[PDB]
Amino acid sequence: AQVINTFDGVADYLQTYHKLPDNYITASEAQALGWVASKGNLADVAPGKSIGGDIFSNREGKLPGKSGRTWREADINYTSGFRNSDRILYSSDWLIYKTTDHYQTFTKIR
Amino acid sequence: MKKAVINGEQIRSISDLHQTLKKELALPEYYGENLAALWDCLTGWVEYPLVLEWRQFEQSKQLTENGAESVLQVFREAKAEGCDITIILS
Known about the structure:
The complex is a heterodimer.
Chain A: H1 7-17, E1 24-25, H2 27-32, H3 42-45, E2 50-55, E3 71-75, E4 87-91, E5 96-99, E6 107-108
Parallel strand pairs in A: 1-2
Antiparallel strand pairs in A: 2-3, 3-4, 4-5, 5-6
Chain B: E1 2-7, H1 14-24, H2 35-44, E2 50-55, H3 57-62, H4 67-80, E3 85-89
Parallel strand pairs in B: 1-2, 2-3
Helix pairs in contact in B: 2-4
């Protein structure tokens, strides 16, 4: 399938199918393929993949917390090289937020 | 390996602490200077192995409110999930 890595397409996919698109791999999976974060070699070892699916602890409480709710995140707009500052955040009950300023601020998108 | 030094006595705000980390850990220019951001960098940016030497930790707690401990906690949590981090608290 073609890469879906935009705020809107990843949000609609998550909302519709309740899972990330297949161009996303978690950081441990990436690491198993030989990703070395400081080398920025993600696209060499896993062509067309983006980091996504890892747990987002929400330590500062900037996303709404509720008992039982877990958050995960995924990189948005990545193609290759070093990672950027855009992330989509999605909960176990399917609330969706984004940030484009490396987690300083968040906007609710679903 | 990567070495980072924090001189606790020079830390006069949670912003100073994030700016020192930005420099010492060679963080992205977009670094969000928050815990979410630091965890993101520790797990998808920073080079390993990493030695963090945190001098005057107690003094850095005074002007960071809960900041210094929250930060240390993120690095401990990174080391708990496999990141190769040595933390020196002096």
